[PDB]
Design a protein around this ligand. Structure first.
Ligand code: SF4
Ligand code: SF4
Ligand code: FES
Ligand code: FES
Ligand SMILES: [C-]#N
Ligand SMILES: [C-]#N
Ligand SMILES: [Fe+2]
Ligand SMILES: [Fe+2]
Lengths: 635, 635
């Protein structure tokens, strides 16, 4: 087996060879077993929205040409996509909702493991929302912020504040004019499910305008999730750590935190440190907590917990034979982990009521009991460590250095060292003079269809050479960090001369004796919202709307419904947005034309669907340069 | 073409022959063009929940055996079903939400076309909810009831009151114990979408318990919708009208009201009466408003508007060439109507923002402007009538007499004529003595897979002969009414001797000089909730829970996601529930076993999946008789 065709990560390749020796089936094996995949589903031309179905439409040829109810290709494709957006919105905003409840519990005195850690963030959010702070206790301001967050999930006398208060007013006005401002987060999710059900909305434009609106409900959930997590757990600032499977340690209790919401795993980090002497008792050096996927990102950003792996290669951490526990919340967890555990010895633990996996051990996490849960979980891990006394392990000796923690506040602080009272100005100055060509946000998943990380690294390398300021989140940040893009030692090799000068100037002003890393890690997938905050602050400072800025986004290897939602609100807020896998839209040319062209006329943004990464990088550069030309700037 | 293989309705058959002459494609033609349908989708063994897909699992044989992420057949089947329930819940509860807003507008003075028509219903709902009425104005009690309705869509300090206040406390306690009581209607819809998204819930039992909970959010939306529609438009009482295509009149302006929410179509009924002289001016006799689907049911129940047709045969009304307008809200409208209109001359009009159809004319209905909208719409219809001056039409001369309007209040009133102060007792007495064997609720759609009405009539005929009290809603009521089951003249032919004696005793006590009809029409699909109210009142009166009563349900020809949701809450509240088409569950034996067997242990109810209607009738009789035996009654 040529393992480079599966993953470009060498640690992953090493574990693919071990899995193949050992007979352990992987995601890649399960993909091969699926080929050829259904061409109706690939093109979007399948509907199962009622029990007359399943319906399909031939992309070309003869009948069937139309759904049994009369639904055209246009309708079928748009309804499918809409439901994917709604599903993504449900995940991000479910995460946010859970943190809103957690904050309320904290400040009501019902969960003393949680607290207001970032009081400055709390007060700033309150002021953005219009919540009064003067003469109020912190707990009462917090209570009010949690109330406001929960209120945005339903209809009320205002629209969703975690949209209307986070974008420029001019953007809010353009979106309002088209009826795109969500009325309530769960309200919009529900309306999508209604309108896409049989015999309801059957006009592609109408359907896709609803999808745009629902993508803003997803944005709101993202931003809410970042705001509340920062209050509770601290706003990230720059941190130095490591990534890839080599961060596992044979002589330690290796515990992965995996999923998205870090509400327990932020506690598992703090508790694990207390339980060092109990680990040594069991003959370990200590507990080694490592991250997978976005819960990993969260604790990497705030605590510098090393990232073990991401997305499509998550099973490989188990294949080492050194992963004593994998502690799961929700989202992006291949349920194969529960069966692979039988072979590898790993204790897989679920913790959220609505996210269980057959064959995994469940712990009923509650905030009020967060410490005692953590200790129970870590004591299963220590027991699992002891069970592999005298078992050889194969941990690839492969890791990278990672500098991360670039929240928007952190980036503004860093810039402030160059201009204390106008911190955005040094960035704008260098956009204007061409040292920075523009900004690209890498976001989203890996996808088994694409050799792991190949699109992120191929595109990022072309953009960096062309002096684009590259920011990343989620498993796009994961890809980039595991390939060295977060190590400032690689700035000379990766970055154009203009970008290098800027990264160096900022880093030297921040006392580093060198540069910021090539790529700025802005956090988890909800922390795509931090990129919004940065770009909206730029917009405000420039007195223009986001669809005039030289800012693009790339979901270069997208997988999840969440990633579809994020791509869609990136287009809705005015960004040219690349997707590097085919969404199920090609079976309708009119819907494709809306999403890739005529939506420009509505929001200013638009999808760029391009599976060849070299070609995608050129198209993203063209988009950036078109924005530069619109502002009258050289390019 | 043998048209009896498509529909058992002779009017439909006549219009199928006309469509075939004229070259007009129908739903049946589009079905034939779809065959053979995809066997993955038929069995549920297809997933498109991420961009790694589409995934499928062979029902039998060799690979693929598992989804690319590891998702088993069990998981894939349960997630698909869950999303169908959520979609149904979104439709019913979207309808309810819209009526909650309408009521608020009414009583705030913002829409003087709407008002509190049923003050007794208002006050009773307020008292059920715990809303105080003593010394309060009607408008303020209404405002409070609308507030409460909207509050049930989100989390709060109570659970969904339109569940917990409408079921027996013992049923609420059984459901609470299993964690099945919804926390908020849109909250549950969103949580379903989250938990079924990639990498989240992956345990069939956990997934299906969430589905049960979400089906109760659907119940809540149903019940809310019936409550609010009764306040605004009046609670139904017995009414005499007609059904089938013969209710169209060549010399009149024929206007169909079609969809579900009647918020404008209740106004179109009242306004149409005012516009008689304007119709005569255009050379019509007057405006003839007729119903299709559940908006038709709503205005049949309250106003005795004749029902033209239902569900799968809706296009046939157009094929007559006499349907001048079809006025659409949302749900269950084959979008083919917009194209068939080009051929037939019919003006198809949409009226709801989130439900448009390419090629239809849109009118932006607003409550504040309800009368002026109605007149605009009716004036398009009159213009269309004039355009078919001297055009032969083919209206099959085929209609039935329909007695309907059996709300729960109406049924209780009717019974009260036999026992004024214990109105349920005469019904219970006749269950106990075997005159009434049990109760069956027919519900749900027609489905092109099943020759139209064949399952409803075949099953109903066997049950009626066995003295079952048969109640119906939606297009199950439609089926039954078009085949004569709502004409009391057919009681001798259709009903067993015990049922006939009861229907006759009630009818004679109500001054009729004969019987109630064979089948009691309890209204639209949301008015399945009325059957819940009746069965819960019986439960309360008997001091037992619903899963001990001899009450079953049959969705004999189900189609819509809404129908899946209704079937699922019928099982959740404790009913043996027949479905006469295959839901996409057969690809997982463990999920099938849960839904058809082990769910009994949780809720007392269970699905009966049976495509042969004779066999289904025997299984439904067996279920009824098993309940009789449990109560110690002969059978
Ligand atoms: S909604 Fe229409 S296209 Fe979809 S499965 Fe049902 S009949 Fe087919
Ligand atoms: S969620 Fe799993 S089974 Fe479904 S499409 Fe994605 S990889 Fe396939
Ligand atoms: S026909 Fe394959 S995705 Fe439905
Ligand atoms: S493979 Fe046909 S429904 Fe997906
Ligand atoms: C990722 N959300
Ligand atoms: C039907 N609902
Ligand atoms: Fe993520
Ligand atoms: Fe209906």
């Amino acid at each position: 087996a040529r393992q480079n065709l599966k993953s470009t990560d060498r640690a992953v390749q090493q574990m693919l060879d071990k899995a193949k020796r050992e007979g352990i089936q992987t995601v890649w094996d399960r993909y091969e077993a699926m080929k050829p995949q259904c061409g109706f589903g690939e093109t979007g031309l399948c509907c199962r929205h009622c029990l007359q179905g399943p319906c399909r439409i031939n992309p070309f040829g003869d009948e069937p040409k139309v759904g049994i109810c009369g639904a055209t290709a246009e309708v079928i494709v748009a309804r499918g996509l809409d439901r994917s957006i709604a599903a993504g919105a449900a995940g991000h905003s479910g995460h946010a909702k859970h943190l809103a409840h957690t904050l309320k519990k904290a400040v009501q005195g019902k969960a003393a493991s949680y607290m207001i850690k970032d009081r400055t963030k709390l007060h700033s959010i309150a002021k953005r929302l219009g919540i009064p702070t003067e003469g109020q206790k912190d707990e009462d301001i917090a209570l009010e912020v949690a109330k406001a967050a929960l209120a945005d999930f339903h209809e009320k006398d205002t629209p969703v504040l975690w949209v209307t208060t986070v974008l420029p007013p001019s953007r809010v006005k353009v979106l309002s004019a088209h009826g795109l401002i969500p009325a309530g987060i769960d309200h919009e999710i529900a309306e999508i499910m209604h309108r896409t059900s049989m015999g309801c909305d059957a006009d592609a434009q109408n359907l896709l305008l609803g999808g745009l609106r629902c993508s803003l409900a997803d944005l709101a959930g993202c931003y809410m999730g970042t705001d509340l997590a920062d209050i509770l757990f601290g706003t990230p600032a720059p941190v130095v750590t490591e990534s890839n499977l080599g961060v596992l340690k044979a002589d330690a209790v290796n515990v992965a935190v995996h999923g998205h919401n870090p509400v327990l795993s932020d506690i598992i980090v703090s508790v694990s440190k207390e339980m060092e002497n109990e680990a040594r008792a069991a003959g370990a050096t200590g507990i080694n907590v490592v991250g997978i996927c976005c819960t990993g990102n969260e604790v990497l950003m705030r605590h510098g917990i090393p990232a073990c792996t991401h997305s499509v290669s998550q099973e490989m951490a188990m294949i080492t034979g050194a992963l004593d526990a994998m502690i799961l919340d929700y989202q992006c967890i291949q349920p194969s982990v529960a069966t692979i555990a039988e072979c590898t010895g790993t204790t897989v633990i679920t913790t959220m009521e609505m996210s269980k996996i057959t064959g995994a051990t469940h712990v009923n996490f509650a905030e009020e009991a967060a410490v005692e849960n953590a200790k129970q979980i870590l004591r299963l891990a220590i027991d699992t460590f002891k069970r592999r006394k005298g078992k050889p392990v194969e941990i690839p000796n492969i890791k990278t250095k990672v500098v991360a923690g670039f929240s928007t506040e952190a980036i503004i602080n860093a810039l402030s060292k160059l201009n204390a009272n106008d911190p955005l100005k040094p960035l704008i100055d260098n956009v204007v003079n061409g040292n920075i060509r523009g900004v690209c946000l890498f976001a989203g998943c890996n996808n088994v269809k694409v050799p792991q990380d190949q699109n992120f690294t191929t595109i990022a390398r072309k953009l960096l050479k062309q002096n684009v300021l590259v920011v990343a989140t989620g498993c796009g940040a994961g890809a980039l960090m595991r390939h060295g893009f977060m190590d400032p030692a690689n700035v000379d090799e990766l970055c154009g001369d203009g970008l290098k000068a800027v990264l160096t100037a900022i880093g030297e002003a921040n006392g580093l004796g060198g540069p910021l890393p090539p790529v700025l890690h802005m956090g988890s997938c909800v922390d795509n919202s931090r990129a919004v905050a940065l770009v909206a602050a730029l917009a405000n400072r420039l007195g223009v709307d986001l669809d005039r800025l030289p800012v693009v986004a790339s979901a270069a290897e997208a997988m999840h419904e969440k990633a579809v939602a994020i791509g869609t609100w990136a287009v809705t807020i005015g960004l040219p947005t690349h997707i590097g896998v085919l969404p199920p839209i090609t079976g309708s040319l009119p819907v494709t034309q809306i999403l890739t062209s005529s939506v420009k006329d509505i929001t200013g943004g638009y999808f760029i669907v391009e599976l060849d990464p070299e070609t995608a990088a050129d198209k993203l550069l063209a988009a950036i340069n078109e924005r530069r030309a619109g502002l009258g700037l050289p390019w």
